[PDB]
Structure 1
Amino acid sequence: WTATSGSCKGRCFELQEVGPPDCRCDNLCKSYSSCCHDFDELCLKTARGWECTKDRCGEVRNEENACHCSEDCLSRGDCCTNYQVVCKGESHWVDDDCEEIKVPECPAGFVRPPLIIFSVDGFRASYMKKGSKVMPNIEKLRSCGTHAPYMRPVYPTKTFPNLYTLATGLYPESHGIVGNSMYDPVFDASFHLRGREKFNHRWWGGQPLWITATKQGVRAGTFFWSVSIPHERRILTILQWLSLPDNERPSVYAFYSEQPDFSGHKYGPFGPEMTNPLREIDKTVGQLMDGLKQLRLHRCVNVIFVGDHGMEDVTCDRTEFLSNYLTNVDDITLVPGTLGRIRAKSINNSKYDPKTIIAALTCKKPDQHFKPYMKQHLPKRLHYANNRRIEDIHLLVDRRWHVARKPLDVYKKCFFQGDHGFDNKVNSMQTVFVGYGPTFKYRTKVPPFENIELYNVMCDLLGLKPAPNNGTHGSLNHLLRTNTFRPTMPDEVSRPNYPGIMYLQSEFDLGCTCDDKVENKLEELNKRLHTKGSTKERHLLYGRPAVLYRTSYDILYHTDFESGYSEIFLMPLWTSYTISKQAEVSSIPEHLTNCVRPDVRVSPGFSQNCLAYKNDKQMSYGFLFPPYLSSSPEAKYDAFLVTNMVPMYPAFKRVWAYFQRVLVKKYASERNGVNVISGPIFDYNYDGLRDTEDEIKQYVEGSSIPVPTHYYSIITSCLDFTQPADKCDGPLSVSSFILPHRPDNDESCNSSEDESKWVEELMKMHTARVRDIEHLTGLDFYRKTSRSYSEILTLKTYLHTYESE
Structure 2
Amino acid sequence: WTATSGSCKGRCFELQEVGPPDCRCDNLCKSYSSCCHDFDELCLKTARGWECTKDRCGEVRNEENACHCSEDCLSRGDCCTNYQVVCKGESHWVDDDCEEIKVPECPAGFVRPPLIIFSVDGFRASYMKKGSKVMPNIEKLRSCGTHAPYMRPVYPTKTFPNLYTLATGLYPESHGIVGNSMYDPVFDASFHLRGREKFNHRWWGGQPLWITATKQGVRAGTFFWSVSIPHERRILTILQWLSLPDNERPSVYAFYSEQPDFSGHKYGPFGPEMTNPLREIDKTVGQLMDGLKQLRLHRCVNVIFVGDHGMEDVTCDRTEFLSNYLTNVDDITLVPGTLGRIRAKSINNSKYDPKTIIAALTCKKPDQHFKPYMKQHLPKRLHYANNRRIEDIHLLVDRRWHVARKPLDVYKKCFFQGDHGFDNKVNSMQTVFVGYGPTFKYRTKVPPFENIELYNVMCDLLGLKPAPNNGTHGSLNHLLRTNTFRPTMPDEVSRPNYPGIMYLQSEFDLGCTCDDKVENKLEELNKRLHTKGSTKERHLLYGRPAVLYRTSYDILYHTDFESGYSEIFLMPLWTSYTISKQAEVSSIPEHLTNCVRPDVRVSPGFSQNCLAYKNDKQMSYGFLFPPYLSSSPEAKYDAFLVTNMVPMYPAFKRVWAYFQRVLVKKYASERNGVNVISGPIFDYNYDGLRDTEDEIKQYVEGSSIPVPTHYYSIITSCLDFTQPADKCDGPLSVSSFILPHRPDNDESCNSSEDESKWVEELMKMHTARVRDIEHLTGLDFYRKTSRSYSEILTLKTYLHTYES
Distance (whole Å) between structure 2 residues aligned to residue 107 and residue 74 of structure 1: 14
Distance (whole Å) between structure 2 residues aligned to residue 761 and residue 315 of structure 1: 27
Which of 224-233 and 676-685 deviates more?
Answer: 224-233
1:257-336 correspondence to structure 2 within 5 Å: 257-336=257-336
Structure 1 residue 225: deviation in Å? 1.1
Distance (whole Å) between structure 2 residues aligned to residue 182 and residue 228 of structure 1: 25
Distance (whole Å) between structure 2 residues aligned to residue 611 and residue 40 of structure 1: 80
Structure 1 residue 645: deviation in Å? 0.2
Counterpart secondary structure, 2:33 = coil
Counterpart secondary structure, 2:284 = helix
Structure 1 residue 520: deviation in Å? 1.7
Structure 1 residue 519: deviation in Å? 1.2
Structure 1 residue 224: deviation in Å? 1.2
Write out per-residue CA displacement over residues 722-777 of structure 1, whole angstroms, 9 at most, x where no aligned residue: 00000000100000000000000000000000000000000000000000000000
Write out per-residue CA displacement over residues 19-52 of structure 1, whole angstroms, 9 at most, x where no aligned residue: 1111100000011111000000010000000000
Structure 1 residue 487: deviation in Å? 1.1
Distance (whole Å) between structure 1 residues aligned to residue 157 and residue 69 of structure 2: 43
Distance (whole Å) between structure 1 residues aligned to residue 82 and residue 195 of structure 2: 37
> TM-score by structure 2 length?
1.00
Counterpart secondary structure, 1:305 = strand
Which of 193-202 and 436-445 deviates more?
Answer: 193-202
Write out per-residue CA displacement over residues 534-559 of structure 1, whole angstroms, 9 at most, x where no aligned residue: 00000000000000000000000000
Structure 1 residue 259: deviation in Å? 0.3
Counterpart secondary structure, 1:642 = coil
Distance (whole Å) between structure 1 residues aligned to residue 6 and residue 17 of structure 2: 14
Structure 1 residue 189: deviation in Å? 1.7
Write out per-residue CA displacement over residues 140-175 of structure 1, whole angstroms, 9 at most, x where no aligned residue: 000000000000000000000000000000000000
Counterpart secondary structure, 2:259 = strand
Write out per-residue CA displacement over residues 435-494 of structure 1, whole angstroms, 9 at most, x where no aligned residue: 000000000000000000000000000000000000000000000000000011000000
Write out per-residue CA displacement over residues 538-593 of structure 1, whole angstroms, 9 at most, x where no aligned residue: 00000000000000000000000000000000000000000000000000111000
Write out per-residue CA displacement over residues 591-636 of structure 1, whole angstroms, 9 at most, x where no aligned residue: 0000000000000000000000000000000000000000000000
Structure 1 residue 353: deviation in Å? 0.4
Write out per-residue CA displacement over residues 635-680 of structure 1, whole angstroms, 9 at most, x where no aligned residue: 0000000000000000000000000000000000000000000000
Counterpart secondary structure, 1:124 = coil
Counterpart secondary structure, 1:342 = strand
Structure 1 residue 190: deviation in Å? 1.5
Report what 1:97 is aligned to: 97
Distance (whole Å) between structure 2 residues aligned to residue 350 and residue 27 of structure 1: 48
Distance (whole Å) between structure 1 residues aligned to residue 524 and residue 24 of structure 2: 85
Structure 1 residue 192: deviation in Å? 1.5
Structure 1 residue 188: deviation in Å? 1.7
Counterpart secondary structure, 2:583 = coil
Distance (whole Å) between structure 2 residues aligned to residue 24 and residue 779 of structure 1: 52
> TM-score by structure 1 length?
1.00
Distance (whole Å) between structure 1 residues aligned to residue 529 and residue 294 of structure 2: 73
1:756-771 correspondence to structure 2 within 5 Å: 756-771=756-771
Distance (whole Å) between structure 1 residues aligned to residue 399 and residue 449 of structure 2: 21
Write out per-residue CA displacement over residues 485-525 of structure 1, whole angstroms, 9 at most, x where no aligned residue: 00110000000000000000000001110000011210100
Distance (whole Å) between structure 1 residues aligned to residue 226 and residue 186 of structure 2: 29
Structure 1 residue 193: deviation in Å? 1.6
The reply on whether 1:710 has 2:710 as its aligned counterpart is: yes
Distance (whole Å) between structure 2 residues aligned to residue 193 and residue 110 of structure 1: 39
Write out per-residue CA displacement over residues 286-333 of structure 1, whole angstroms, 9 at most, x where no aligned residue: 000000000000000000000000000000000000000001000000
Distance (whole Å) between structure 2 residues aligned to residue 149 and residue 193 of structure 1: 31
Distance (whole Å) between structure 2 residues aligned to residue 756 and residue 406 of structure 1: 37
Counterpart secondary structure, 2:32 = coil
Distance (whole Å) between structure 2 residues aligned to residue 589 and residue 191 of structure 1: 61
Distance (whole Å) between structure 2 residues aligned to residue 397 and residue 654 of structure 1: 26
Distance (whole Å) between structure 1 residues aligned to residue 6 and residue 412 of structure 2: 44
Structure 1 residue 414: deviation in Å? 1.1
Distance (whole Å) between structure 1 residues aligned to residue 796 and residue 724 of structure 2: 21
Report what 2:786 is aligned to: 786
Which of 574-583 and 17-26 deviates more?
Answer: 17-26
Report what 2:185 is aligned to: 185
Report what 2:49 is aligned to: 49
Report what 1:458 is aligned to: 458
Write out per-residue CA displacement over residues 329-348 of structure 1, whole angstroms, 9 at most, x where no aligned residue: 00000000000000000011
Unaligned stretches of 5+ in structure 1? none
Distance (whole Å) between structure 1 residues aligned to residue 520 and residue 732 of structure 2: 41
Distance (whole Å) between structure 1 residues aligned to residue 282 and residue 122 of structure 2: 15
Counterpart secondary structure, 1:293 = helix
Distance (whole Å) between structure 2 residues aligned to residue 182 and residue 577 of structure 1: 46
Distance (whole Å) between structure 2 residues aligned to residue 667 and residue 97 of structure 1: 47
Structure 1 residue 187: deviation in Å? 1.7
Report what 1:397 is aligned to: 397
The reply on whether 1:361 has 2:384 as its aligned counterpart is: no
Report what 2:772 is aligned to: 772
Structure 1 residue 94: deviation in Å? 0.2
Distance (whole Å) between structure 2 residues aligned to residue 520 and residue 710 of structure 1: 44
1:343-742 correspondence to structure 2 within 5 Å: 343-742=343-742
Counterpart secondary structure, 2:31 = coil
Write out per-residue CA displacement over residues 219-249 of structure 1, whole angstroms, 9 at most, x where no aligned residue: 0111111111110000000000000000000
Structure 1 residue 183: deviation in Å? 1.1
Write out per-residue CA displacement over residues 365-396 of structure 1, whole angstroms, 9 at most, x where no aligned residue: 00000000000000000000000000000000
Distance (whole Å) between structure 2 residues aligned to residue 663 and residue 499 of structure 1: 33
Counterpart secondary structure, 2:643 = helix
RMSD: 0.4
Distance (whole Å) between structure 2 residues aligned to residue 215 and residue 669 of structure 1: 54
Structure 1 residue 102: deviation in Å? 0.2
Distance (whole Å) between structure 2 residues aligned to residue 607 and residue 166 of structure 1: 47
Structure 1's consecutive aligned runs of 4 or more residues displaced over 2 angstroms after TM superposition are none
Distance (whole Å) between structure 2 residues aligned to residue 474 and residue 673 of structure 1: 29
Write out per-residue CA displacement over residues 194-229 of structure 1, whole angstroms, 9 at most, x where no aligned residue: 111110000000000000000100001111111111
Distance (whole Å) between structure 2 residues aligned to residue 108 and residue 563 of structure 1: 60
